Design a protein around this nucleic acid. Structure first.
Lengths: 104, 247, 125, 50, 36, 102, 50, 17, 85
RNA sequence: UGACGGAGCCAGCGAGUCUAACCUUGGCCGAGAGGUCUUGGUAAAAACUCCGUCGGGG
């Protein structure tokens, strides 16, 4: 009467926290500001299911992604996948001009 | 013999000078004797580089500008996966006109590093992509055959696309460089890059360029220079010229 | 010749010309069948001069329309006015006057602006 | 021309209205070959020409 | 005078876009197959 | 011709004549436990472990049409009444089952 | 001589096309048959011209 | 030490003209 | 467990029961529940269902398996002148 | 009280041989005026319906 099987909370990667219940692309873009399709690429690089939760997906595929992200220029990944004292002068010029006129 | 001397000197002073620190190529001035009789267009004819590859298609931002319905080309070049990582953006010209007017255009200019258009749309393009693209030889949009099919006269040409061929063409474009003809006698090709390769690379590049331009065959592209070649000045954009080979 | 009758419909700045000639029973609008008049919510605004008077009266004539001007909703109202005036005018011409009367009673009891122009001419109060 | 269009009188009848035609877009269609019979041919003339 | 005397007894050109043969991409075998 | 099959946090509608996926319901917080179409075929009801059920229009994955909060304990079983068409009989893990009227 | 020859074959073909049309004009009960290749042809009904 | 040399070349050529 | 009645079969009724061993075994209440047939899907099994009695198409049998596996087994199902002559 | 793609779909006024920028890096020719080419930087129908996608700000 037992069923067999194969989790964590908010996780930490690359000295940053990564979500727990949003999907993998949004996780990797929360990793700082990189592109959604770039994360889609990296997920294909993992050969990971795209629409798995962030509470799944164990530490060995996590570190594989860590390797890939810390080495973008090494697995043939392009960089686009990666990424009034003058106003003092003009007010002085103004006052001097208007001195001159209102004097004349 | 003098070329390397002039080259190293300009290299040194272009990391030194403030205004010269901000630009990243080298231009070559071939001054023919007689003018090339070819009236100028912006169909940038391409020259090959045997020894060295200039840029990397896995480094450059690419815009691709195609024919109307765009269904076929978009799905195929996205789902082939030998080009899925290749193009930053795919746009048909109806979308381009309907989406980009004003100075969002200039936003696209500064954003995208190289623009490539379908061969039968290039002539229509200069309106929509605007005027500030057609400055010099920096971001002149190139043109590529896409379906690899000839329209025999009075025949409905099939509409098709093969991603292998398109990535072959783009690898050619990104690996070598391109000139553009003049009604006058002096032209300047784009060669080199600051940090990406060095003096022997650029010297062999120069030799291959002048050899191709002076090749008496390859008549639309090789056999082009008419008269005696006078000189070649090496310079970046904001520089002063450096003289080479005055005989 | 052909038995053929032309009518006109009109809302804010649209126009719609219907030619009705005796034929086999097709209905087209700018060179496409009526079942693709576009805004797709108001398709039944266009179908109601058909389904108020039954399909057979259109089984025996070939109604063919062209519109222009205006926007979505205006072209819808011009099409249906032109069709309704087209069907009742052909019936007066090339069949009986009684069936002209029964048609026009149907369209008028349901909605008189199938037949007369809904001109909101201004008012200075 | 704009003043004439303003006093058009939309009841005028001239007799050559039976020969001359128009568009759907309003302005009138004039033939390039001249006369009321100078539009198109017949089968006996076309056979002899062939 | 044998070919033409046999008669009496017996680079993608286009029509309408001639920016092409000036502007084509002269691809190569290395340019095709070098899997980057 | 179609059948629902649950997963972890994902209710899928597979097809029958093409035996492939059709549609994906994936707006659930924790893992989702029972999925069942109605009598007439219109609605799908799905109860998950947070303790809320959602009934929403099958073949229309974007209208979370009526979310009924059952007990705070998980609701393992959420079924629609067959004989009637509008009483959702749900269960729970709270040892108490309920007949809601939708 | 060769250029004369090509002129002659081309005029021959133009006369082939023109002659087929002239006889489509004449009479009879034709039938318009369509080949595989795209080429059309006509085939007359089996009847005696009177 | 070549850049300023050719600068002086250009300058002096044109002022000589 | 699942029960399905009046589908085009020599069995008028069938009851298919599923038992966490690969074993999905199919029984019938007109021959007093004697075992009729059985598949052995690999892992333990959590659910089974056959497509209903009004399928009118290719019927299916799906079983869903405790390691995250579906196994699906599907049973499929000139001239107008000339004529008037 | 929505983003993001694609895809469909509809106006009414405008029609004087007149309609339109600024800097720049250098080459060539000319005795000069300037002419020709080259290079970089800054200024200038929509709604609507349809299909998929998403679910505080420097």
């Amino acid at each position: 009467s037992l069923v067999v099987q194969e989790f964590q909370h908010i996780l930490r990667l690359l000295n940053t926290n990564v979500d727990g219940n949003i999907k993998i692309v949004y996780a990797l873009t929360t990793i700082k500001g990189v592109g959604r399709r770039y994360s889609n690429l990296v997920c294909k690089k993992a050969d990971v299911d795209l629409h798995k939760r962030a509470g799944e997906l164990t530490q060995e595929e996590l570190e594989r992604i860590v390797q890939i992200m810390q080495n973008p220029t090494h697995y043939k990944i392009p960089a686009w996948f990666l990424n009034h004292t003058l106003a003092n002068n003009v007010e002085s010029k103004l006052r001097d001009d208007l001195e001159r006129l209102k004097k004349i | 013999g003098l070329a390397e001397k002039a080259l190293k000197a300009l290299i040194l002073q272009c990391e030194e000078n403030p205004s010269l620190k901000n630009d990243k190529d080298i231009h070559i001035i071939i001054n023919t004797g007689k003018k090339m009789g070819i009236n100028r267009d912006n169909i940038p004819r391409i020259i090959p580089l045997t020894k060295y590859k200039l840029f990397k298609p896995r480094d450059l931002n690419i815009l691709l500008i195609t024919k109307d319905p765009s269904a076929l080309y978009r799905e195929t070049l996205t789902k082939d996966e030998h080009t899925s990582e290749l193009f930053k953006e795919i746009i048909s010209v109806k979308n381009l006109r309907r989406r980009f007017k004003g100075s969002k255009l200039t936003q696209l200019y500064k954003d995208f590093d190289l623009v490539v258009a379908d061969y039968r749309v290039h002539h229509l393009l200069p309106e929509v992509l605007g005027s500030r693209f057609y400055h010099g030889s920096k971001k002149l949009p190139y043109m590529i055959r896409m379906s690899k099919e000839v329209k025999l006269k009075r025949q409905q040409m099939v509409e098709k696309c093969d991603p292998i061929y398109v990535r072959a063409q783009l690898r050619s474009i990104c690996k070598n460089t391109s000139y553009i003809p003049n009604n006058d006698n002096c032209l300047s090709v784009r060669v080199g890059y600051i940090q990406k390769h060095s003096i022997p690379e650029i010297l062999q590049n120069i030799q291959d360029t002048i050899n191709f331009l002076t090749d008496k065959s390859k008549r639309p592209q090789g056999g082009v220079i008419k008269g005696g070649i006078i000189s070649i000045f090496v310079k970046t954009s904001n520089s002063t010229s450096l003289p080479i080979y005055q005989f | 010749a052909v038995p053929s009758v032309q009518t006109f419909g009109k809302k804010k700045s649209a126009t719609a010309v219907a030619h009705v000639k005796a034929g086999k029973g097709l209905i087209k609008v700018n060179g496409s069948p009526i079942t693709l008049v576009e805004p797709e919510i108001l398709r039944f605004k266009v179908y109601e001069p058909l389904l108020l008077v039954g399909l057979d009266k259109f089984s025996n004539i070939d109604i063919r329309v062209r519109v222009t001007g205006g926007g979505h909703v205006s072209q819808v109202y011009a099409i249906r006015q032109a069709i309704a005036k087209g069907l009742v005018a052909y019936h007066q011409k090339y069949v009986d006057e009684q069936s002209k009367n029964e048609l026009k009673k149907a369209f008028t009891s349901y909605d008189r602006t199938l037949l007369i122009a809904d001109s909101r001419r201004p008012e200075p109060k | 021309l704009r003043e004439k269009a303003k006093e058009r009188n939309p009841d005028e009848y001239y007799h050559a209205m039976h020969s001359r035609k128009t568009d759907a877009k309003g302005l009138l269609i004039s033939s390039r070959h001249g006369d009321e019979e100078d539009e198109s041919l017949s089968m006996d003339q076309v056979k002899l020409l062939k | 005078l044998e070919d033409i005397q046999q008669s009496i007894l017996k680079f993608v050109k286009d029509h309408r876009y001639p920016g092409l043969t000036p502007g084509l991409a002269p691809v190569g075998l290395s340019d095709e197959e070098d899997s980057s | 011709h179609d059948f629902a099959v649950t997963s972890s946090t994902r209710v899928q509608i597979f097809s029958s004549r093409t035996r492939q996926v059709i549609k994906t319901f994936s707006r659930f917080k924790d893992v989702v436990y029972s999925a069942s179409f109605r009598s007439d075929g219109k609605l799908l009801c799905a109860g998950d472990a947070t303790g809320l059920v959602s009934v929403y229009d099958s073949y229309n994955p974007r209208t979370i049409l009526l979310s009924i909060n059952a007990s705070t304990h998980p609701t393992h079983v959420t079924k629609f009444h067959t004989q009637d068409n509008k009483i959702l009989a749900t269960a729970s893990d709270d040892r108490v089952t309920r007949l809601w009227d939708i | 001589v060769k250029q004369h020859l090509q002129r002659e074959t081309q005029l021959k073909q133009v006369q082939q096309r023109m002659d087929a049309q002239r006889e489509l004009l004449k009479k009879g009960s034709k039938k318009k048959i369509v080949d595989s290749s795209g080429k059309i042809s006509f085939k007359w009904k089996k009847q005696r011209k009177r | 030490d070549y850049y300023q040399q050719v600068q002086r070349g250009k300058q002096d050529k044109k002022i000589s003209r | 467990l699942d029960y399905v009645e009046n589908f085009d079969s020599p069995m008028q009724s069938a009851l298919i029961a599923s038992s966490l061993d690969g074993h999905v075994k199919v029984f019938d209440p007109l021959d007093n529940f004697q075992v009729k047939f059985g598949w052995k899907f690999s892992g333990p099994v959590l659910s089974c269902a056959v497509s209903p009695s009004t399928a009118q198409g290719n019927r299916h049998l799906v079983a869903g398996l405790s390691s995250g596996l579906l196994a699906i087994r599907t049973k499929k199902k000139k001239s107008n002148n000339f004529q008037r002559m």
